[PDB]
Design a binder for this molecule. Structure first.
Ligand code: NDG
Length: 129
């Protein structure tokens, strides 16, 4: 799919993300524009060979099943391609957990620099929720 600004982000609050586990509502949609640019089908492999998947940019190395990453933990227990499709109804049970890791956003790279020290509510702003 291709999501709009106010249209790609109303479903997180549909998936337990409002102020979930220490992270506030303004702190989320920013990074989505920073990892696959509001696009779910944007997947990319890394120099490190762990293919990242989805708008989320998750590597096949630590989190999912692609078969080209051996010794991969695959803790999420879901085929990597189980996210990218138009319905992401389940894609978040893993991200909802990737934070309890005690690293939280430590996994995501874009935010820590592009959304860190930012005006996060400036992203959640103008939209009715
Ligand atoms: C630049 C890029 O996409 N790198 C990814 C990052 O998105 C992801 O959070 C990380 C998890 O360990 O795998 C890679 O570092």
């Amino acid at each position: 799919k291709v999501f709009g600004r106010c249209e790609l982000a109303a479903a997180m609050k549909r998936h337990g993300l409002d102020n979930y586990r220490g992270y506030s509502l303004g702190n989320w949609v920013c990074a989505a524009k920073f990892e696959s640019n509001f696009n779910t089908q944007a997947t990319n492999r890394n120099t490190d060979g762990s293919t990242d998947y989805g708008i989320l940019q998750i590597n096949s190395r630590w989190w999912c099943n692609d078969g080209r990453t051996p010794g991969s933990r695959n803790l999420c227990n879901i085929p990597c391609s189980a996210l990218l499709s138009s319905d992401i109804t389940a894609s978040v049970n893993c991200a909802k957990k990737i934070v309890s890791d005690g690293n939280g956003m430590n996994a995501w790279v874009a935010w820590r620099n592009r959304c860190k020290g930012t005006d996060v509510q400036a992203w959640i702003r103008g939209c009715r929720l």
